[PDB]
Amino acid sequence: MQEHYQPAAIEPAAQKKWDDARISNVSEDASKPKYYCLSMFPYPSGKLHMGHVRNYTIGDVLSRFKLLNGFNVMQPMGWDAFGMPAENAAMKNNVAPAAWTYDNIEYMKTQLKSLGFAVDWEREVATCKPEYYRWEQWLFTKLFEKGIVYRKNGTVNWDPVDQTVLANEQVIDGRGWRSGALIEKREIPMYYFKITDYAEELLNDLDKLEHWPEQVKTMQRNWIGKSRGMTVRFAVSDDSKQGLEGDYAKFLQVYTTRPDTLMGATYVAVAAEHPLATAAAADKPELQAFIAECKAGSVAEADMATMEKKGVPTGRYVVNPLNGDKLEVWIANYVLWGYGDGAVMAVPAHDERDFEFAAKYNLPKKQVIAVGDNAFDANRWQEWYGDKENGVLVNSGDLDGLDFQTAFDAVAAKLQSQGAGEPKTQYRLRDWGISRQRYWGCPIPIVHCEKCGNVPVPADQLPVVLPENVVPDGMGSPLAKMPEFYETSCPCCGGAAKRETDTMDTFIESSWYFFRYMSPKFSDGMVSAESAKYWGAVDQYIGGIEHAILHLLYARFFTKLMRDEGLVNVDEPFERLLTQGMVVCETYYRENDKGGKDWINPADVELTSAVLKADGLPVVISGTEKMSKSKNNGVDPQELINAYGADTARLFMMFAAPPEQSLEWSDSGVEGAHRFLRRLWRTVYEYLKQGGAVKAFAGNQDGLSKELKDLRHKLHSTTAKVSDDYGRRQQFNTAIAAVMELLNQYDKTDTGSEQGRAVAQEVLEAAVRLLWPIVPHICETLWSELNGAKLWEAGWPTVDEAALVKSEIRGKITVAADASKADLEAAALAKIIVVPGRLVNIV
Ligand SMILES: CC(C)C[C@H](N)C(=O)NS(=O)(=O)OC[C@H]1O[C@@H](n2cnc3cc(CO)cc(N)c32)[C@H](O)[C@@H]1O
Ligand SMILES: [Mg+2]
Numbered sequence: 152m153q154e155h156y157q158p159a160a161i162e163p164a165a166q167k168k169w170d171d172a173r174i175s176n177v178s179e180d181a182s183k184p185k186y187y188c189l190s191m192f193p194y195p196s197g198k199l200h201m202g203h204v205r206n207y208t209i210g211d212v213l214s215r216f217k218l219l220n221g222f223n224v225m226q227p228m229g230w231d232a233f234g235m236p237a238e239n240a241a242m243k244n245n246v247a248p249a250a251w252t253y254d255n256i257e258y259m260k261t262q263l264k265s266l267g268f269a270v271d272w273e274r275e276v277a278t279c280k281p282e283y284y285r286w287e288q289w290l291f292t293k294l295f296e297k298g299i300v301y302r303k304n305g306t307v308n309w310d311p312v313d314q315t316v317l318a319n320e321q322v323i324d325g326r327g328w329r330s331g332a333l334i335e336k337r338e339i340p341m342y343y344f345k346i347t348d349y350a351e352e353l354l355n356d357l358d359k360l361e362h363w364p365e366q367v368k369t370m371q372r373n374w375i376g377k378s379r380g381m382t383v384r385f386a387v388s389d390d391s392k393q394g395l396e397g398d399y400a401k402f403l404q405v406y407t408t409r410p411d412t413l414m415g416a417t418y419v420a421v422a423a424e425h426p427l428a429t430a431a432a433a434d435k436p437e438l439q440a441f442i443a444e445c446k447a448g449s450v451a452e453a454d455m456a457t458m459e460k461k462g463v464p465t466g467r468y469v470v471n472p473l474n475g476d477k478l479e480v481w482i483a484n485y486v487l488w489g490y491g492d493g494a495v496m497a498v499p500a501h502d503e504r505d506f507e508f509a510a511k512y513n514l515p516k517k518q519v520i521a522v523g524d525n526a527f528d529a530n531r532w533q534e535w536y537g538d539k540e541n542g543v544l545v546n547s548g549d550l551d552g553l554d555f556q557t558a559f560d561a562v563a564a565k566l567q568s569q570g571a572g573e574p575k576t577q578y579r580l581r582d583w584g585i586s587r588q589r590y591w592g593c594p595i596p597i598v599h600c601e602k603c604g605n606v607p608v609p610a611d612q613l614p615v616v617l618p619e620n621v622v623p624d625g626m627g628s629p630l631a632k633m634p635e636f637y638e639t640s641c642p643c644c645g646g647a648a649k650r651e652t653d654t655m656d657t658f659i660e661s662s663w664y665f666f667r668y669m670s671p672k673f674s675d676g677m678v679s680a681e682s683a684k685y686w687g688a689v690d691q692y693i694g695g696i697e698h699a700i701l702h703l704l705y706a707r708f709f710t711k712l713m714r715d716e717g718l719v720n721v722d723e724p725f726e727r728l729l730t731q732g733m734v735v736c737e738t739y740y741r742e743n744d745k746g747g748k749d750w751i752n753p754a755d756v757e758l759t760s761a762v763l764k765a766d767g768l769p770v771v772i773s774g775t776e777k778m779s780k781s782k783n784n785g786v787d788p789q790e791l792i793n794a795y796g797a798d799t800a801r802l803f804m805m806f807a808a809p810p811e812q813s814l815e816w817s818d819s820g821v822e823g824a825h826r827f828l829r830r831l832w833r834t835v836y837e838y839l840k841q842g843g844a845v846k847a848f849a850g851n852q853d854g855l856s857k858e859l860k861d862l863r864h865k866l867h868s869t870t871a872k873v874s875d876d877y878g879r880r881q882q883f884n885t886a887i888a889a890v891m892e893l894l895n896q897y898d899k900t901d902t903g904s905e906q907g908r909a910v911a912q913e914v915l916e917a918a919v920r921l922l923w924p925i926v927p928h929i930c931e932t933l934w935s936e937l938n939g940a941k942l943w944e945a946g947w948p949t950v951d952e953a954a955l956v957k958s959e960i961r962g963k964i965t966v967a968a969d970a971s972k973a974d975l976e977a978a979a980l981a982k983i984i985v986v987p988g989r990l991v992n993i994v
């Protein structure tokens with residue numbers, strides 16, 4: 152055994168040993184209990200990020216722990232390959248998105264393999280291969296026939312200088328990001344998933360997920376946004392009916408979740424697209440400009456509450472059906488056309504947004520709720536203003552004294568006898584738009600024929616193959632410019648027809664890949680029936696918090712879609728969910744002659760302050776933040792592997808912080824990981840250099856010295872701690888410190904005797920197995936030096952309960968070192984000032 156720890160000498164061999172034994176290439180063996188542990192698969196962006204290593208190390212710890220516990224573990228990996236980065240790279244470097252993708256995949260695959268993750272590479276998938284995406288085209292055609300996929304016109308942002316569509320996140324002050332040109336709103340036909348049909352299913356089934364962070368569950372409940380409210384109709388005043396037609400001349404209909412405050416409405420608000428706004432703006436140019444500015448906006452709902460709320464009065468009035476009050480109609484920028492009736496009522500006293508709106512415009516506020524004897528102040532908001540639980544109505548005529556629900560029912564009854572309203576359930580959730588005006592994505596399997604209409608491609612003809620021999624130019628997506636692709640024959644009548652040129656939202660690939668891993672070479676369906684029945688659902692899912700809403704909701708949606716098609720049998724794809732934090736690093740800069748800052752990478756800086764590694768000209772040390780190209784602070788994990796080995800990388804990510812926490816890049820941290828691995832190596836080496844391996848101590852520990860009993864107590868205590876940390880708590884830094892404490896106590900125990908060496912063998916054989924999930928290369932190597940059996944078949948260390956039993960310490964008795972003085976005095980009496988450990992005072 153070499154004296155010094157050298158990871159490049161040991162990590163290739165251990166990997167070859169694991170590969171040769173095929174421990175991670177798993178089948179559907181019904182003679183072993185399955186465990187499906189899955190990490191969110193990456194975009195083939197080019198190379199691994201430190202965030203990738205953190206995520207996949209965590210997955211590997213959990214996977215190796217379950218394997219060591221005798222599970223049939225599947226840990227699959229693959230490539231979320233479609234999307235914009237390949238297209239941007241194609242436009243910048245004059246290469247095909249497919250070519251750039253496959254090169255990144257094969258490079259990143261080598262990096263993953265070098266880190267020694269226990270991965271079933273036989274189950275690899277790449278979503279940009281037709282053998283993969285044909286199956287989402289297939290599901291598409293079936294849902295299209297059932298109407299779950301449908302086609303309606305939608306509005307998009309059109310950049311006329313870049314000649315493509317832009318999401319709202321790419322519009323700043325009404326202009327495109329990479330162009331600066333004013334975008335135009337356009338209505339184009341697009342395809343949608345009728346996800347709103349599954350809204351109550353997707354909401355209620357969240358309650359089943361006892362092993363998900365309640366933060367994630369709560370963010371999904373808020374996103375679906377179900378409310379039980381009330382449709383209320385306010386009749387248009389006779390002096391306000393000019394220019395209106397139909398039901399819009401008779402009443403303004405709104406939806407509200409607080410009908411118990413209808414008596415407190417002091418104005419109503421309407422969206423810019425509403426016929427009342429249209430009729431009021433007919434001869435008022437200030438309203439026209441407000442309506443245009445509202446339509447010009449492109450505000451994503453991640454920022455539509457940050458938006459300053461503005462409004463304009465219309466001079467039109469409506470009548471409150473419960474008190475007959477006349478209420479002015481306002482056009483407001485926060486009322487969105489397409490949500491409910493595109494019109495709301497406002498109760499400034501009991502809705503904080505209404506309060507602030509009424510405060511800006513000096514609109515009236517009428518208190519109709521009271522909570523205890525709390526004081527109501529019309530000029531400062533208070534949290535209790537909005538309480539529904541502990542409140543009673545006031546200033547509400549015959550409704551006074553009622554609580555929330557009884558008032559709700561009383562208002563529904565009053566409105567329904569009058570025909571002025573009725574209860575209604577609403578959801579914030581919108582249908583899922585999937586059309587993308589991009590090339591590098593899965594083709595939509597629809598053909599347009601002027602005789603037959605929008606026709607799905609027959610299953611016999613799937614896939615619609617995306618041509619890989621394309622280089623995006625930047626003057627529109629290429630598929631619309633490629634008659635060789637879109638000119639085709641109608642599969643229904645045989646005549647001239649054109650393929651859909653839009654591609655699918657790339658979230659679609661990642662909404663079902665976890666099922667595809669179960670049978671990735673299955674040619675007859677999305678997933679084999681045999682394999683879906685065996686593997687069931689994912690037991691453990693691990694990925695970043697940035698996917699808590701969209702991806703997980705889509706994933707749960709597709710699972711219920713696939714279940715309803717008869718392809719799978721589970722209601723929910725993900726049993727346990729672990730969300731990993733960010734990775735941050737310090738940033739560096741030198742100032743600009745043009746009054747700015749230029750951001751230097753950490754690898755090109757050396758800290759004494761700090762100065763460059765090139766010019767030696769000092770750089771300024773700045774703030775710590777998420778590793779990214781913005782402030783050029785990403786640390787390449789490849790150079791960390793090059794400089795220290797994979798086990799160091801893995802250990803450092805697991806020790807620095809718990810998974811949910813942000814992991815700070817730390818050079819002193821990495822050096823500490825390496826040194827502990829060096830200490831682990833030397834400990835085993837020094838142990839063998841004195842006597843060589845012996846049979847590990849087992850059995851009755853009577854006759855062992857107090858010192859060696861104490862070490863066995865620490866050992867099996869550490870084993871139980873680590874197991875509870877891997878299985879339950881999923882905090883891996885605490886497990887590492889526990890093993891470090893075990894080694895500390897070993898270091899201070901004389902283990903030189905014969906029973907001493909037997910206990911030392913027991914200690915070391917357990918520690919290497921307890922650390923194998925975090926650092927399997929060095930543990931595999933040291934284990935072979937200690938014991939000739941196969942580590943993965945020796946299995947997870949067992950706790951020895953006997954080793955936790957502590958000893959036996961006008962009349963004396965005997966009591967355990969775990970008893971207490973309540974029975975120490977009950978055993979002595981067979982005021983008693985008990986002497987814990989020497990006597991007892993019978994007064
Ligand atoms: C299932 C689908 C939707 C996954 C998708 N292909 C994806 O996000 N693909 S991805 O390639 O972007 O990331 C794959 C996984 O690794 C994590 N990750 C990667 N780079 C990271 C950098 C930092 C910086 O602090 C932090 C984290 N957490 C990072 C990321 O959260 C995700 O769980
Ligand atoms: Mg359950």
Ligand SMILES: [Zn+2]
Nearest residue numbers: 600603641644
């Ligand atoms: Zn036809």
